[PDB]
UniProtKB/Swiss-Prot annotation:
Gene source species: Bos taurus (Bovine)
Molecular-function annotations in GO: endopeptidase activity; metal ion binding; serine-type endopeptidase activity; serpin family protein binding
Cofactor(s) the protein needs: Ca(2+)
Catalytic activity line of the entry: Preferential cleavage: Arg-|-Xaa, Lys-|-Xaa
Positions contributing to Ca(2+) binding: 52, 54, 57, 62
One Gene Ontology term, aspect cellular component: extracellular space
Protein name: Serine protease 1
Source taxonomy: Eukaryota, Metazoa, Chordata, Craniata, Vertebrata
UniProt PTM comment: Subsequent cleavage after Lys-125 leads to alpha-trypsin. Further cleavage after Lys-170 yields pseudotrypsin. A cleavage may also occur after Arg-99. Not sulfated on tyrosine residue(s).
Entry EC number(s): 3.4.21.4
Residues that bind substrate: 171-172, 174-175, 177
Similarity section: Belongs to the peptidase S1 family.
Amino acid sequence: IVGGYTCGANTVPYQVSLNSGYHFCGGSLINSQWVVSAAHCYKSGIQVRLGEDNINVVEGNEQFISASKSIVHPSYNSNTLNNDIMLIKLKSAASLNSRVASISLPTSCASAGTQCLISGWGNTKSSGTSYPDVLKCLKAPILSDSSCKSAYPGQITSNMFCAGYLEGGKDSCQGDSGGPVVCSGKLQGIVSWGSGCAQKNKPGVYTKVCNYVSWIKQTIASN
Ligand SMILES: [Ca+2]
């Protein structure tokens, strides 16, 4: 997250870190046994880390649970990043409380102008690299589809939305991928892609979760 603020420990209780020896992507806890992330974060050997603030220090609220099954969306296209969504089943159920909690799925899609909360452990610089140990947060609005398509001609599908600031300076970034965009208490986006980070006229692009609720629910019911 570029241009954000320190969230505070366990203030984003649905945020998870995906770990394969190191943090590599975010995700969101959607019930006690399932996480949603970005398909471009797929790899084998995932440990899901819940209850984290500092990802390099054991602070006392963590739960570390291996994945038993990963399911990339049937229609994910790695060249265009269309359908950039993946479900991860935990080997055992997490223990839910105030500091580790699920986020609800949306019943309707959010409109442009809605303010959302984006969070992650990704790069904090638009030039150069500095990776934080503690969770960072950013409040940002959903942009109109027309603004989004203007910024990225030929690249925005119906399964994507833009959020952020056309003036630059505030955005998600590398290492935030897979993490949540929460608006009015519902998961509306997944950190997916952008051109650089926090550049003028290049806002972040997010997977539009409301298009996937049926697939999510059906998949969880059968796996
Ligand atoms: Ca920790």
